[PDB]
Amino acid sequence: QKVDDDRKHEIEAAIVRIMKSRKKMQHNVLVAEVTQQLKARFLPSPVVIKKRIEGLIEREYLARTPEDRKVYTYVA
Amino acid sequence: AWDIVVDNCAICRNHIVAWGVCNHAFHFHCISRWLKTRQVCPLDNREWEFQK
Amino acid sequence: YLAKHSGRQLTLQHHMGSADLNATFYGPVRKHILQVSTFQMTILMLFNNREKYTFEE
Structure with a gap:
């Protein structure tokens, strides 16, 4: 569990970078991309996949987009 | 144990062998804060991605 | 070093x-030569040093 939690940030970093490079997609598309990115590293539940994407702003690396409840945009 | 002075690791205000990616003896929060602007760590001239 | x-x-x-x-x-x-760990070698050496052994030793 600790290894999965540690690798969650690394897996979600790529998703956050892709979202920042795109900044325009469906609300569920952002969650699906995050789930697919973390599928290769481990097998997280959909709630865990959503939490990993939502915690990107809390990682002290980028920010989030409060306008969309599901789509997240990373400033950096 | 690493002779890197565990009393002060970096600018994190969270206190502090273990092998990482920059070998700068920095906490997880400090590494993330540093990577918020530049991913390159200015301590080993190599790409840093953190570990453990 | x-x-x-x-x-x-x-x-x-x-x-x-x-x-x-x-x-x-x-x-x-x-x-x-007996292969023992660093922490667990003291009691083994003490037991093998003499015949009488005790917990307090």
Whole structure:
């Protein structure tokens, strides 16, 4: 569990970078991309996949987009 | 144990062998804060991605 | 070497200190190096040093 939690940030970093490079997609598309990115590293539940994407702003690396409840945009 | 002075690791205000990616003896929060602007760590001239 | 190379991750395992010491026994009533851990070798050496052993020792 600790290894999965540690690798969650690394897996979600790529998703956050892709979202920042795109900044325009469906609300569920952002969650699906995050789930697919973390599928290769481990097998997280959909709630865990959503939490990993939502915690990107809390990682002290980028920010989030409060306008969309599901789509997240990373400033950096 | 690493002779890197565990009393002060970096600018994190969270206190502090273990092998990482920059070998700068920095906490997880400090590494993330540093990577918020530049991913390159200015301590080993190599790409840093953190570990453990 | 550790003092000269400050901040270098070149060290051995403290909890798994490898050593092969020839413990001295009371003899028959031959001798070979016994593989023991760093922390658990003291009690083994004390028990093999004499015949009488106790928890307080």
